[PDB]
């Protein structure tokens, strides 16, 4: 298979403006949202249809209870963070957890925290310890690392539990996640040469330019990979053309095990 990943995100905000939630949490498989919960709806509900159709209501009922608990634990943690920083007003606290199942069969796994959109604590499941960015983070690290059993639990979840959920979700959503829609590549001018691809899935595409058979890095202007709104992505990559000497420019596109070249 290609590389697939599963990750879960949490956001907490200490002094939210009116109507904006205090806690949100979304899960993704690859680029697709699969679950959501927040402090307003107070319910865990799917964000993808193939999730809804394969997990029985007892599953949503169970994880709603858990997430109501984790919402409160998240409020408590952000309270403790903001007070140790001596910070007024509204601040955010974020967590990401998840895992990657690679093509060759290896796996990876990550858990890390953020405060005001900056790294706060990053877990290392090999050395079984936490990295601390500042001294508020250092104090939390010392408290977390004491509970040796809890660290061992994270290691086991990232390496086993997460990878097993990922495999399970990969089957539920296989018609979506494992399909290929190859891309529609064209060239035009604006003076620069633009190489524009569209209509492809998965969103992982590599597009570089080539001058007379040598790769360029500094000259090339790369566009982002963007959602089109229909389940497919578009990207581009420009280059600026030499007005004094002629060159053989060729756009290279790589996507899902198929490499293709456009001579100009």
């Amino acid at each position, epitope marked *: 298979m290609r590389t697939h990943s599963l990750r879960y995100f949490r956001l907490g905000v200490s002094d939210p403006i009116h109507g904006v939630p205090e806690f949100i949490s979304v899960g993704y498989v690859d680029s697709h949202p699969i679950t959501t919960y927040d402090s307003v709806t107070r319910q865990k509900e799917p964000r993808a249809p193939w999730m809804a159709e394969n997990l029985a209501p007892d599953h949503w009922e169970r994880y709603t209870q*858990l997430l109501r*608990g984790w919402q409160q*634990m998240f409020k408590v943690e952000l309270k403790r963070l903001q007070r140790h920083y001596n910070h007024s007003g509204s601040h955010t606290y974020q967590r990401m957890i998840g895992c990657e199942l690679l093509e060759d069969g290896s796996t990876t796994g990550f858990l890390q925290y953020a405060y005001d959109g900056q790294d706060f604590l990053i877990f290392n499941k090999d050395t079984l310890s936490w990295l601390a960015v500042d001294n508020v983070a250092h104090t939390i690290k010392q408290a977390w690392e004491a509970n040796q059993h809890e660290l*061992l*639990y994270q290691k086991n979840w990232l390496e086993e*539990e997460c990878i097993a959920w990922l495999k399970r979700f990969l089957e539920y959503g296989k018609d979506t996640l494992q399909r290929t829609e190859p891309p529609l590549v064209r060239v035009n001018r604006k003076t620069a040469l633009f190489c524009k691809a569209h209509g492809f899935y998965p969103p992982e595409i590599y597009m570089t330019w080539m001058k007379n058979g040598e790769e360029i890095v500094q000259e090339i202007d790369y566009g982002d990979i963007l959602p089109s709104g229909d389940g497919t992505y578009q990207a581009w990559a420009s280059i600026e053309l030499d007005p004094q000497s002629s060159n053989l420019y060729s756009c290279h596109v790589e996507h899902s095990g198929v490499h293709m070249v456009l001579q100009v």
Partner: antibody
Amino acid sequence: GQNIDQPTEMTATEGAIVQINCTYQTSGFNGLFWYQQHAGEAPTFLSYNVLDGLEEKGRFSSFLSRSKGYSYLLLKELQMKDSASYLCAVKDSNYQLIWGAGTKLIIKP
Amino acid sequence: NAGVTQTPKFQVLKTGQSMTLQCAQDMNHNSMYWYRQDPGMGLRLIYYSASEGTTDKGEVPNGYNVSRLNKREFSLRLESAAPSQTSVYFCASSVWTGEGSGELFFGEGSRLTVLE
């Protein structure tokens, strides 16, 4: 999580070693706990194992084999006050404990 | 620190009678549980309260209701006792639910006998 099995009773002698086995067949695995329950009283946490291997805590050590699906609780140098039930519990994929029936442990003086 | 306090320690009830077991914990925990222990089976969960503000069914909720009155207290009500509800009931608490490594702390138990 649907199945835990441990023996109903075990009898050993004061001063000996005894080894209580727990075999779980569960959907997911977030850890295996041992509790002690003296007769007529409340269960008390003895140990936790989530990775493979063996953790010691005084006269009690507990072992876990995630692949084989079994743990055991090892009591060395048995004393009369170790006569209790020993309860085994496994957290499944949804963090729900699954309790074994217990093992009543009788000590001959 | 008082631990987990539950009451009553013993109780006789006639079929169809009402009753309510109380449980408090001064450990500042967030998760609270009601189990029932029966001969030959492992503990079965009846209701649980993952944190102050929510409660949910366990494995055997039929014939019971609960009330997470505040953070400290979580009571188990039987409204029409049955002979099958003759059992020993234990209350438990843990710091958070879903921590994986977090252990359970039990109350002293309640022995109930329901007679016709």
